[PDB]
Amino acid sequence: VVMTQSPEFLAVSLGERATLECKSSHSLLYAPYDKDALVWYQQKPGQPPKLLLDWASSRRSGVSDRFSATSASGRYFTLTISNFRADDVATYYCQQTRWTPPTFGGGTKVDLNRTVAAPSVFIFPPSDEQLKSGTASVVCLLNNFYPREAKVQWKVDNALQSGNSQESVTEQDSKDSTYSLSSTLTLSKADYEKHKVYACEVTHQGLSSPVTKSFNR
Amino acid sequence: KEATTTLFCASDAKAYETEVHNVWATHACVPTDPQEVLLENVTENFNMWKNNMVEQMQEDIISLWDQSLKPCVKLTGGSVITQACPKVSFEPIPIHYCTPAGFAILKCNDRNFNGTGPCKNVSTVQCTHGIKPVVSTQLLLNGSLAEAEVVIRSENFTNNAKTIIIQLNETVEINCTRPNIRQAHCNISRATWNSTLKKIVAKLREQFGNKTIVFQPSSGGDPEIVMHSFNCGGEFFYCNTTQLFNSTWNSEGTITLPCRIKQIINMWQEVGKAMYAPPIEGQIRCSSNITGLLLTRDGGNNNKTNGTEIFRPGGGDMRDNWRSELYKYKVVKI
Amino acid sequence: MKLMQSGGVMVRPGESATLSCVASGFDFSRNGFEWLRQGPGKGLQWLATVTFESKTHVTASARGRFTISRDNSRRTVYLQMTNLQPDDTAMYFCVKDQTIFHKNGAVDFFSYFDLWGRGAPVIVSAASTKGPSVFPLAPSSKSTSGGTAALGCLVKDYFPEPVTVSWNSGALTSGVHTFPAVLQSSGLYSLSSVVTVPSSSLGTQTYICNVNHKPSNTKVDKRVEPK
Ligand SMILES: *[C@@H]1O[C@H](CO)[C@@H](O)[C@H](O)[C@H]1NC(C)=O
Ligand SMILES: *[C@@H]1O[C@H](CO)[C@@H](O)[C@H](O)[C@H]1NC(C)=O
Ligand SMILES: *[C@@H]1O[C@H](CO)[C@@H](O)[C@H](O)[C@H]1NC(C)=O
Ligand SMILES: *[C@@H]1O[C@H](CO)[C@@H](O)[C@H](O)[C@H]1NC(C)=O
Ligand SMILES: *[C@@H]1O[C@H](CO)[C@@H](O)[C@H](O)[C@H]1NC(C)=O
Ligand SMILES: *[C@@H]1O[C@H](CO)[C@@H](O)[C@H](O)[C@H]1NC(C)=O
Ligand SMILES: *[C@@H]1O[C@H](CO)[C@@H](O)[C@H](O)[C@H]1NC(C)=O
Ligand SMILES: *[C@@H]1O[C@H](CO)[C@@H](O)[C@H](O)[C@H]1NC(C)=O
């Protein structure tokens, strides 16, 4: 039994309404209760998920009335968050519990909409002490941008690199609602020494065209 | 026309017989007779689940018990009563239900008729067959066998909350004895029981899909529905039926069931609890025909592709006991 | 109503581990419990159920490798994992499902979870416990934009998680972002912590990163200066 959610990421403004979609491959109608056996969870980072609603449309006790949900045909489900606020930023999972095994929606990440913000971009050469170690890490920082879609491309002596990079992303900042991102290119000293120009090229909807920070060494 | 009226009962009660069904029937019931008329080319819809005859029998047996089996103490709706609670002679007798002037009982003679929907082989009768008002859970005792094939009946099979009433077509004898104190036991054929289960599994597969069928014991409620409970000689027997209902169906010897005679019981007549006196002394024994069963089916999440149905002994509402005998009849106004 | 979990666990590939969960504040006798698995950058997956009758189901991808069980006298639920593999590295949740009892004796079962344990990390790896190496991310011309400078620490090659990073012994928090760790090709973890500061403060403010890796009982202080 396949559960599909959409979208994967959802930005909502500070008083508006979130509309999350969940699609079941099969009917989750449980005939004897005349209820759809579908459930909605909230999960914040670091916490176990919290059960918001059961049998598709029924709030759990304690759950804010700003939360509600909908079912059609026993297959299509909508979760709604009115008056979206800071403490609603989370991953929401739907779960079918009509058939065995129970299966999970895959999640929708809801964050706060906000004016677009271009990243500040910074590049850091490997430290020499690290080079003593035989390894070189070059770090690219995209500091405080919005939304959380950006592309980092590493280029060395302008030849595009692949597979020699890793990245990570902060959660949305609780005060100004931006993100930060770090991309790291890691090489053997041999490999570092084979090349001259190291450049990090960044694409983001806040920039008019890609921005390049680079160094020679 | 379909109709609700006040049916009266008929029986072979004896005025010089102190047994409590006899005494009760002597005042409540006319002496038993029989006339049966076949109604040609008539087809009539039945619904055993909405049959006021069941409610009437219920009222009568409640009254019979209330006069006959006095608990020493009764607690209902938070109110307590205490009273004399003498031992009695107790052996159910057949009771017939009959229509007064202006009304007729229609009877469905279709083979393996499930109790609802259209019947094409219909007769009228003055009275029902003789029904022993046996009070029990899980197992139906001393009833009538189906003539042709094993039958299962439910008000709605898709609703697992509705009890499934099984009518066997060959009886299974169960012998229950408390020897020469609250401990007793029942014996039954391992092989006979397995054959019976096999025929039930077949009829259930016809109903739900040849899904794997499993039997498991009662689990969760009152001792009355967790155990097989019944009355023998005035004593309330509670028999552990785990061995009967532990089975998986995919592709020899005696069974001995441990029982306890209980003094403190949950009542079937009404919500409350009742205490009767301790067992009489001496051997207490009943040999009964299991002629039917009451089952419930587990529900909730199951595999879509290969569903397996889990069944447990059920019962509790004695109305289902009466319908298990009353399913072929309805009352109509002429 | 509480489920108190027991973990977490660290373990070499192929070894076995056990997780427990202890229930209080309701009736253990009449409830079933289950174990759920969450992958890093994941992702929720059901693993095993034990019903109130001690009937057990396990997912087929883990059948004959994981085992669920139950001790009613101590109100405890268990997950035995066998032949653990680096894939199996995740957060494990104890959860209470739904068991519905009817008047006539029928029982409905529903596998959704009003009650969650705290979660217990199980990490499977051939890496030995190792404290991090700390390298400076020095600022420069190409690390400063206008009035803001960026500096940091690269915390590389440690195992297992977690590391804690502070700045100036905790005195500096504004503008620090310590990024989530990434699992490296080595089976070791790596992350960076950066902070933006006024560019004018570079010569005149001391900036020191404090790294604590409790699993190796390791503390490191790395002072970051331009160059
Ligand atoms: C049988 O039960 C199902 C489940 O409650 C219900 O949806 C259906 O309407 C019922 N059928 C009839 C004829 O009442
Ligand atoms: C009960 O079984 C006996 C044989 O042991 C039989 O004579 C009697 O007719 C049966 N009663 C029923 C099936 O109601
Ligand atoms: C009883 O019914 C079963 C079908 O459920 C059938 O196979 C069997 O022959 C019947 N036995 C008698 C004695 O009627
Ligand atoms: C009994 O059988 C008839 C024959 O088709 C069917 O229409 C009816 O639904 C059945 N009764 C029940 C309660 O399922
Ligand atoms: C049951 O009782 C009858 C006599 O009433 C006896 O012939 C039979 O062997 C008994 N069977 C068992 C299993 O006790
Ligand atoms: C019935 O007997 C079985 C087997 O010993 C046992 O597991 C069960 O607890 C018994 N039932 C009750 C209600 O004690
Ligand atoms: C359930 O049945 C199996 C075999 O059918 C048996 O080994 C087990 O003891 C039974 N459980 C009981 C009698 O409680
Ligand atoms: C069933 O009938 C037999 C004989 O007809 C009787 O001895 C036995 O006590 C009856 N069982 C019940 C529970 O009334």
Sign of CA dihedral C191, C195, C200, C205: negative
Residue with tokens 């259930």: B204
Element (H, E) at B124: strand B122-125
Alpha carbons B11 and B26: distance in angstroms, whole number: 8
Q: Say if ligand 2 is within 6 A of residue B310 CB.
A: no
Q: Which domains does chain A have, with CATH numbers?
A: 1-113 (2.60.40.10), 114-217 (2.60.40.10)
CA–CA dist B196, B114 (Å, integer): 19
- For residue B99 and ligand 6, the question of a CB distance below 6 A is answered with no
Instruction: Provide the 8-state DSSP code for A117.
Output: B
This structure was determined by X-ray
Residue indicated by tokens 């160094």: A215
**What is the radius of gyration, based on Cα positions, of chain C?**
23
CA gyration radius, chain B: 20
Same-domain status, C11 and C80:
yes
**Which residues, at least 6 apart from A29, have a Cβ–Cβ distance to it below 8 Å?**
A35, A36, A37, A74, A98
Give, for B206, the enclosing helix (H) or strand (E).
Answer: helix B190-208
Q: Strands, E, within B68-218: which ranges?
A: 73-76, 79-82, 96-98, 103-108, 116-119, 122-125, 139-141, 151-153, 164-178, 183-189, 213-215
Return d(Cα B176, Cα B284) in angstroms, integer: 8
CA distances to A50, A102, A188, B33, C101 from A39, in Å: 11, 11, 49, 62, 20
Question: Which is nearest to C52 in space by CA: C66, C36, C72, C67?
Answer: C72
**In terms of DSSP H, where are the helices of A29-186?**
128-132
The HSE-up count of residue A42 (CA atoms within 13 Å, CB side) is 18
**Contacts C180 to A, Cβ<8 Å:** 168-170
Q: Which residue has the tokens 């219909």?
A: B122
**Cα–Cα distance list, B205 to B169, B251, C67, C109, C220 (Å):** 17, 12, 32, 22, 70
C144 and C51 share one domain? no
Distance CA A22, CA A77 (A): 5
- What are residue A126's phi and psi, to 5 degrees? -65, 150
Q: How far does residue B94's CA lie from ligand 8's centre (Å)?
A: 11
SS3 per-residue string spanning B303-321: CCCCCCEEEEECCCCCHHH
Which of C135, C184, C191 lies closest to A127 in CB terms?
C135
Structure tokens at A88: 């609603």
Check if the beta carbon of residue B43 is closer than 8 Å to that of residue B120. Answer: yes
Q: Taking CB atoms and an 8 Å limit, are C154 and A167 in contact across chains? A: no
| CA C136 to chain CA centroid, nearest Å | 27
Q: Which residue among A32, A100, A102 places its CB closest to the CB of B160? A: A32
CA distance A182 to C193: 9
CA gap B259, C180 in Å, rounded: 64
A35 close contact with B: CB closer than 8 A = no
DSSP annotation of B271 reads S
CATH number of the domain residue C9 falls in: 2.60.40.10
Per DSSP, chain B holds a count of helices (H) and strands (E) of 5, 25
Least Cα separation, residue B222 to chain C (angstroms) = 9
Separation in Å, CA C146 to CA B28, B278, C205: 106, 97, 18
At the second CATH level, the architecture of B1-334 is Beta Complex (2.170)
- H/E stretch holding A43: strand A38-43
Whether residues C31 and C81 fall in one domain: yes
Q: Are residues C116 and C164 in the same domain?
A: no
The answer on C132 and C102 residing in a single domain is no
Contact C152/C134 with Cβ under 8 angstroms? no
Comparing alpha-carbon positions, the chain A residue that sits nearest to B308 is A100
Out of A100, A180, A184, closest to residue C177 by CB = A180
Asked which of C101, C126, C151 is the last residue of a domain, the reply is: C126
Ligand nearest to the CA of B256: 5
| Residues 6+ positions from A26 with CB-CB distance below 8 Å | A1, A75, A96, A98, A99, B304
* Nearest Cα to Cα of residue C134 among C220, C53, C212: C220
DSSP H or E run through A19? strand A18-24
State the Cα–Cα distance between residues A102 and C48, nearest whole angstrom. 10
Q: Quick one: which of B276, B266, B265 has its CA closest to B88?
A: B276
Q: What distance in angstroms lies between residue B324's CA and the mean position of ligand 4's atoms?
A: 16
Listed in sequence order, the residues at least 6 apart from A72 whose beta carbon sits closer than 8 Å to its beta carbon are none
Q: Say if the Cβ atoms of B304 and A99 lie within 8 Å.
A: yes
| Residues, chain A | 217
Q: Are C199 and C148 in contact (CB under 8 A)?
A: yes
Residue C2 and residue C112 in one domain: yes
DSSP tag of C160: S
C117 and C142 share one domain: no
Q: Residues A37, A55: contact at Cβ < 8 Å?
A: yes
Give the torsion sign (CA, C154, C160, C161, C166). negative
What does A128-149 look like in DSSP terms, one character per residue? HHHHHTTEEEEEEEEEEEBSS-
Specify the DSSP class assigned to residue A49.
P
**What's the token pair of residue B116?**
């609802």
Chains that touch A (3 or more CB pairs under 8 A): B, C
Question: What are the residues facing C34 on neighbouring strands?
Answer: C49, C95
Breaks (C-N over 2.5 A) in chain B follow: 33, 180, 251
DSSP B131: B
Distant-in-sequence, close-in-space partners of C41: CB < 8 Å, separation ≥ 6:
none
The token pair that represents B27 in the structure block? 């005042």
CA distance B194 to B190: 6
Could you tell me how many helices (H) and strands (E) chain C has, helices first? Answer: 0, 20
Same domain, C150 and C170: yes
Cα dihedral C209, C214, C215, C220 sign: positive
> Distance (Å, rounded) from C-alpha A86 to C-alpha A63?
16
The answer to whether C72 and C65 have CB atoms below 8 angstroms apart is no
Beta-carbon contacts of A67 under 8 Å, excluding residues fewer than 6 positions away, are: A52, A53, A59, A79, A80, A81
The token pair that represents B68 in the structure block: 């006959």
Between CA C116 and CA C4 the distance in angstroms is: 9
Tell whether C109 is within 8 A of chain B (Cβ).
Answer: yes
What does the DSSP 8-state code read for residue B224?
A: H
In DSSP terms, which residues pair with B210 in a beta bridge? none
To one decimal, the resolution in angstroms is: 2.7
Phi and psi of B79, rounded to 5°? -100, 135
Cis amide bond preceding C8, omega within 30:
yes
Domains: count for chain C: 2
Is B277 exposed, middle or buried (CB count within 10 Å of its CB: 0-12, 13-18, 19+)?
middle
Last residue of a domain, one of C95, C126, C157: C126
Alpha carbons C194 and A144: distance in angstroms, whole number: 12
Same domain, C103 and C157: no
C68 token code pair: 């669920």
Q: Which helix (H) or strand (E) holds B326?
A: helix B319-326
Cα–Cα dist C37/C124, whole Å: 14
Q: Which residue does chain A place closest to C48, by CA atoms?
A: A101
Question: How far is B154 from A51, CA to CA, in rounded Å?
Answer: 36
Give me the amino acid identity at B313: P
Residue C19's DSSP bridge partners are C79
Say yes or no: C4 and C109 in one domain.
yes
DSSP string, B21-83: HHHHHHHHEEEP---EEE-TT--EEEETTS-HHHHHHHHHHHHHHHHH---SEEEETTEEEE-
Residues C191 and C163 in one domain: yes
Please state whether beta strands B36-38 and B29-31 pair in parallel, antiparallel, or not at all (unpaired): unpaired
Last residue of a domain, one of C67, C92, C126: C126
For C23, the domain range is 1-126
Residues of B in contact with C104 (CB under 8 A): 161-163, 225, 296, 314-317
Is residue C48 domain-shared with residue C113, that is, in the same domain?
yes
- The answer, yes or no, to whether any atom of ligand 6 lies below 6 A from the CB of B242, is yes
Neighbours of chain C (3+ CB pairs under 8 A): A, B
Q: Are B302 and B177 in contact (CB under 8 A)?
A: no
